[PDB]
Amino acid sequence: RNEEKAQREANKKIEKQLQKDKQVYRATHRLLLLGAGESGKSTIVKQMRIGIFETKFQVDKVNFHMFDVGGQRDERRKWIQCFNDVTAIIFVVASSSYNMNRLQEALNLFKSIWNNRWLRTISVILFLNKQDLLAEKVLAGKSKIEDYFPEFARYTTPEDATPEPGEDPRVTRAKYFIRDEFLRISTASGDGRHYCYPHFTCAVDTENIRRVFNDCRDIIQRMHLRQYELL
Amino acid sequence: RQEAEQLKNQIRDARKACADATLSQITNNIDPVGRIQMRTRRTLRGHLAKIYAMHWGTDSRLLVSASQDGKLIIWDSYTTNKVHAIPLRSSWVMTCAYAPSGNYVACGGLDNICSIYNLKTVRVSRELAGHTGYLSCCRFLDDNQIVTSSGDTTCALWDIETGQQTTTFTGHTGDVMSLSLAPDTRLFVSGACDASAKLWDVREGMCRQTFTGHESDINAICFFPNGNAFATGSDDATCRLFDLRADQELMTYSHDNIICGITSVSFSKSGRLLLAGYDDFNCNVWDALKADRAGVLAGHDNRVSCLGVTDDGMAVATGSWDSFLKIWN
Amino acid sequence: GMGIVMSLIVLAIVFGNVLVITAIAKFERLQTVTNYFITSLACADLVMGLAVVPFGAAHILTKTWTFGNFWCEFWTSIDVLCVTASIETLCVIAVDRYFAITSPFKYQSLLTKNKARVIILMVWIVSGLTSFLPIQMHWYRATHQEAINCYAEETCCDFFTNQAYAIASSIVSFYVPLVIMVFVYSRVFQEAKRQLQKIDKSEGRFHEHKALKTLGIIMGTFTLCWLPFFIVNIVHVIQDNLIRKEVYILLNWIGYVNSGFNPLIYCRSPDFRIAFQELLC
Amino acid sequence: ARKLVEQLKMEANIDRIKVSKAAADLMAYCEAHAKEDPLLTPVPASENPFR
Ligand SMILES: Nc1nc2c(ncn2[C@@H]2O[C@H](COP(=O)(O)OP(=O)(O)OP(=O)(O)O)[C@@H](O)[C@H]2O)c(=O)[nH]1
Ligand SMILES: CN[C@@H]1CCc2c(ccc(O)c2O)[C@H]1O
């Protein structure tokens, strides 16, 4: 008869501890770091710092937890079903490797990620790394994007572009062509449930930890707006 | 080195020579089991996130479960109250096991480590490392040795006391997703992502037979109570029953109105009923000897990922992504 | 005649609220913090449609109150209680949506299943405090001769009140929970427009009416149903011989119909559709 | 590829039985143990610990 009382006491203690654990579980936001080789992923994670890997960083009293997977590396991805409850996916792609094709492989990987059945409601934050190697290759470079990407010939600069001051039109055309080549895949089958947030980054950049914060806030706000039939 | 095609043709012809008659022809005058209706008896709550695995105890009373919030909870089915709750170092776990002696619990996950816990001492007792890919399943062969399957297309037979691999099994091409042990624990089967299942010898460490029925990834595998047959479930919405002695399949279980994947497979005590979990938010009950549906187990609000039947065959438990466990009877 | 219309109104009020309550109770996927306020609102509407509408209809048709004075006072108390508890819940729902949208990173901490019960109980206490307390006590009674004459008799049950109560109850019930709702929904509309502008700027080349339609429906039904009555309520007390009794009762009954529209507005999500299809279908 | 050829050779020399005998054995086992599975045959509620 006392066994039931002891079991009930243990149950009460366990539920009491679970009550405390639930608060911290709901407080934190989880991110997944996913990028191809030579992207510059290690530099990006190192600058945010200042078979698995975990990183803690807090911005304005909000707990963000980011995961990097390196132990399981294969063309086939079966573990990706485990990440259908994350807030966002961080995609890192090397913008200057359009001839070393690596850019086409990254585009194929992005297309495969976007159309997965378990990632229907997950947004993607896109980082287009290596903004200075690309500028060096474009300005007075032997190689040209025309041969590797024939679609570049009939591409015109959008009238809504906001170039950084002092940069040439050619690098702007190249950058916007590369960005729109991803936006085209993003917009095809979005259905309004998830979007893509493209960015331009480099080695000397100090606002990425704030960019992730802003993008996650926008993601949550848009989700809440859509749930109530207002967007 | 092109002679392998001749060997495969010879094996196929030898298998086709033994096909005297189908299983349906043999089992045609047996009266059907009829409609089987089960209702939920217990519901267990306390997991903050989705559930990936469970494993019944050998006493048909206690059971263990794992969730993505990084926690293992040992339940008490009779009185639906918790007994233990073990926090985990890494929150991504894909499997769990319960020792036959009831003294240990194992768990593995996306980190390439299998951890065991001493229940009657709850602290970590050993950590097994050496796999280069994520773990998919693990089963206690004894109180001192455990067999595990990983995502680097290998299986190993570990030694808990020393922590070093004793035997390594190779031969699959794709990821290994599940395994099951024979009742006498002499041979075990496994199902890979190359749509093939193999039979392994524990003591010798070599592959005895190979089965090539399915056309997609095999997610679940189970073993017949007799020990001379086994069943597998794949993504093409079909379950197939193979046979060790005959060396080919005997029957397929599929319906034209279902197109979802299969996540779990289990048998009953007599082996007459085959229970399989699907992605359609529910579970199906089959007739092993006639290939006819005999019931539906509905009530889960998310996909079913776990399934198990007690040693005495008194009840069946299902776990789902809704973070709830249900007991059916 | 009118009996068929009144019976249809009673049936429509009862059926939807009972269905919503049972749907929330039976399925565990609907047990959300937001669905507790809807449960309280449905309880208030069901109580009103099952308690005050039938007896008011009988009093209108018979043209004579056939119950004692105590039952007349009890009926008036229940009427005021339900009316003032069915609007503060709408205010609470609006504030919850405000917090969910404008503060996305702190919504989980701000609202908890423990705090929702406290808010609901406080709402119901403040609601019932203004209804039973000054009506069971005779503080709301009027002074002119018609009021005293009707109070003396045991066959007439009419609403006679002084200026102070007619202003205070109206301010508590309607005017305070209106400015809050207006401000909240204006801010929500601004946030929706701001997000839509960002989407258009970012990806408009490849590719504010839904928000306008939804907010228009939500605000318009409530304002149209309950606004005229809570103006004529002050009016007929400020100056006499201005509002006839028939118009007063007509506008009051127009207000009652708002209880039949809440399930059609707050329970239109696909999850509620699936729940309604699973049972009784 | 020598290992693959050796493995195919090993798995081709085995003793196989006709599937009629296998089906008969399965049916015999299922019929023999048919009375001792509570799921298939509903036992009385007195012996059910989940009631
Ligand atoms: N100039 C320039 N160099 C960069 C940038 N991002 C990364 N790199 C350099 O690229 C080199 C290789 O990248 P790492 O970050 O070291 O690693 P990785 O080879 O990209 O592979 P990961 O470890 O997956 O990133 C490093 O030495 C970086 O300094 C950039 O934006 N501009
Ligand atoms: C008899 N009908 C009553 C009369 C006055 C009144 C109502 C509702 C809310 C109030 O705050 C009131 O003062 C009406 O329902």
mmCIF file of C-alpha atoms and ligand atoms in Angstrom, chain A residues 38-43 129-130 132-133 202-203, ligand 1:
data_model
loop_
_atom_site.group_PDB
_atom_site.id
_atom_site.type_symbol
_atom_site.label_atom_id
_atom_site.label_comp_id
_atom_site.label_asym_id
_atom_site.label_seq_id
_atom_site.Cartn_x
_atom_site.Cartn_y
_atom_site.Cartn_z
ATOM 1 C CA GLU A 38 34.726 25.602 -49.202
ATOM 2 C CA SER A 39 31.754 27.876 -48.553
ATOM 3 C CA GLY A 40 33.345 29.671 -45.686
ATOM 4 C CA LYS A 41 31.117 28.150 -43.059
ATOM 5 C CA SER A 42 33.860 27.852 -40.429
ATOM 6 C CA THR A 43 34.771 31.532 -40.764
ATOM 7 C CA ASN A 129 29.792 34.452 -48.961
ATOM 8 C CA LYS A 130 33.097 35.605 -50.499
ATOM 9 C CA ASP A 132 35.656 40.093 -52.578
ATOM 10 C CA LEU A 133 36.967 37.104 -54.556
ATOM 11 C CA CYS A 202 32.331 38.660 -46.641
ATOM 12 C CA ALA A 203 35.271 38.020 -44.314
HETATM 13 N N1 LIG E 1 38.445 37.049 -48.970
HETATM 14 C C1 LIG E 1 37.537 36.268 -48.347
HETATM 15 N N2 LIG E 1 37.940 35.063 -47.889
HETATM 16 C C2 LIG E 1 37.078 34.245 -47.258
HETATM 17 C C3 LIG E 1 35.695 34.673 -47.069
HETATM 18 N N3 LIG E 1 35.069 33.678 -46.418
HETATM 19 C C4 LIG E 1 35.977 32.691 -46.209
HETATM 20 N N4 LIG E 1 37.170 33.040 -46.717
HETATM 21 C C5 LIG E 1 38.420 32.256 -46.688
HETATM 22 O O1 LIG E 1 38.262 30.979 -47.300
HETATM 23 C C6 LIG E 1 39.164 30.067 -46.675
HETATM 24 C C7 LIG E 1 38.525 28.697 -46.540
HETATM 25 O O2 LIG E 1 37.306 28.835 -45.822
HETATM 26 P P1 LIG E 1 37.184 28.319 -44.308
HETATM 27 O O3 LIG E 1 36.137 29.152 -43.609
HETATM 28 O O4 LIG E 1 38.570 28.219 -43.728
HETATM 29 O O5 LIG E 1 36.632 26.820 -44.460
HETATM 30 P P2 LIG E 1 36.120 26.250 -45.871
HETATM 31 O O6 LIG E 1 37.300 25.693 -46.624
HETATM 32 O O7 LIG E 1 35.216 27.267 -46.513
HETATM 33 O O8 LIG E 1 35.198 25.034 -45.397
HETATM 34 P P3 LIG E 1 34.269 25.272 -44.117
HETATM 35 O O9 LIG E 1 35.142 24.872 -42.956
HETATM 36 O O10 LIG E 1 33.083 24.380 -44.377
HETATM 37 O O11 LIG E 1 33.960 26.742 -44.159
HETATM 38 C C8 LIG E 1 39.512 30.647 -45.317
HETATM 39 O O12 LIG E 1 40.926 30.787 -45.193
HETATM 40 C C9 LIG E 1 38.817 31.987 -45.251
HETATM 41 O O13 LIG E 1 39.674 33.014 -44.753
HETATM 42 C C10 LIG E 1 35.336 36.002 -47.599
HETATM 43 O O14 LIG E 1 34.178 36.438 -47.480
HETATM 44 N N5 LIG E 1 36.282 36.721 -48.208
#
